Scaffold this active site. Structure first.
Site, PDB file in Angstrom:
ATOM      1  N   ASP A  91       0.708  -1.264   0.000  1.00 15.71           N
ATOM      2  CA  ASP A  91       0.000   0.000   0.000  1.00 15.71           C
ATOM      3  C   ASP A  91       0.729   1.301   0.000  1.00 15.71           C
ATOM      4  O   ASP A  91       0.225   2.311  -0.516  1.00 15.71           O
ATOM      5  CB  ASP A  91      -0.890   0.050   1.262  1.00 15.71           C
ATOM      6  CG  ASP A  91      -2.208  -0.069   0.873  1.00 15.71           C
ATOM      7  OD1 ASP A  91      -3.179  -0.050   1.651  1.00 15.71           O
ATOM      8  OD2 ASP A  91      -2.207  -0.204  -0.373  1.00 15.71           O
ATOM      9  N   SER A 191      -1.094   4.965 -15.181  1.00 14.74           N
ATOM     10  CA  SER A 191      -1.053   3.862 -14.248  1.00 14.74           C
ATOM     11  C   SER A 191      -1.705   2.643 -14.791  1.00 14.74           C
ATOM     12  O   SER A 191      -2.862   2.698 -15.224  1.00 14.74           O
ATOM     13  CB  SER A 191      -1.805   4.249 -12.957  1.00 14.74           C
ATOM     14  OG  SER A 191      -1.204   5.457 -12.530  1.00 14.74           O
TER      15      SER A 191
END
Ligand SMILES: N=C(N)c1cccc(COc2cc(OCc3cccc(C(=N)N)c3)cc(C(=O)N[C@H]3CC[C@H](N)CC3)c2)c1
Lengths: 241, 4
Positions: A91, A191
């Site tokens: 994360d 992304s």
């Protein structure tokens, strides 16, 4: 993509656009087989207003050129039935920033829609090698997405250089690709999309997944990408591909 | 895979 040009129509037929329901283009992906895409794990995280991890929430557009023309001839639209995030995805660091997406029904191969080759586990993309980053993301830092798919040519950066440039942030799953002098880079909205590497007989292999960067196009801040060879067996294990 |  910062510092790029418009792709030709059909030039990157593995490049996929992921739309989240009611939000338009969120991330890129790559076609790798009739039923599977590779993307970045970070695109699939819930937040308090939207379950980006839920496959029903997504639409994949294959053979797309122009975000305003999603219903052009040759454009295929697909749902996802499954998002497999790498179990080691981190994360905070973006370590293991890779996901596999299963199309709800198979892509239909055509001259606009075609899978990217996947590199074997022991293949190394060498420092210095030219490769291509594509996407509809920001064409400037703090700037606005592209309607027409963008391509830019960048270069694999030496791993030690990369680590030094971005201290305590670069893991061996990560690879800096771009220019120390800036100028050309991926950016927000790119992304999850593929790095394309032209190989020995002209066939294109995937050299990375667009992951993160500090701003875009800045001096001494090359864009950071998830390596592919390292995940070849994991992909085989999970998809049959 | 990988061409046009
Ligand atoms: N120049 C480039 N090559 C480039 C290319 C692509 C993108 C970008 C920038 O876009 C970023 C970057 C990002 O990074 C977090 C970070 C991850 C590791 C490393 C450092 C670091 N500075 N070392 C930062 C997260 C997000 C983001 O989407 N966070 C959501 C997560 C879920 C939340 N609930 C909602 C927000 C977007 C740049």
């Amino acid at each position: 993509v910062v510092g790029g040009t418009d792709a030709d129509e059909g030039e990157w037929p593995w490049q996929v656009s992921l739309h989240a329901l009611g939000q338009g283009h969120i991330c890129g992906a790559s076609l790798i087989s009739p039923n599977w895409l590779v993307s970045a794990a970070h695109c699939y995280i819930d937040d308090r207003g939207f379950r980006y991890s839920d496959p029903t929430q997504w639409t994949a557009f294959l053979g797309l050129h122009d975000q305003s023309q999603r219903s052009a001839p040759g454009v295929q639209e697909r749902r996802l039935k499954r998002i497999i995030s790498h179990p080691f995805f981190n994360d905070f660091t973006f370590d293991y920033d890779i996901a596999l997406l299963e199309l709800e029904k198979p892509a239909e191969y055509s001259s606009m829609v075609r899978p990217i080759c996947l590199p074997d586990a022991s293949h190394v993309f060498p420092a210095g090698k030219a490769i291509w980053v594509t996407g509809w993301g920001h064409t400037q830092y703090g700037g606005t997405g592209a309607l027409i798919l963008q391509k830019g040519e960048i270069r694999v950066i030496n791993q030690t250089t990369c680590e030094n440039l971005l201290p305590q942030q670069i893991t061996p799953r990560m690879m800096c690709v771009g220019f120390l002098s800036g100028g050309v880079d991926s950016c927000q909205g790119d992304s999850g999309g593929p790095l394309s590497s032209v190989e020995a007989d002209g066939r294109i292999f995937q050299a990375g997944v667009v992951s993160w960067g500090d701003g875009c196009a800045q001096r001494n801040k090359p864009g950071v990408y998830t390596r592919l060879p390292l995940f070849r067996d994991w992909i085989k294990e999970n998809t049959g591909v | 895979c990988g061409l046009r």
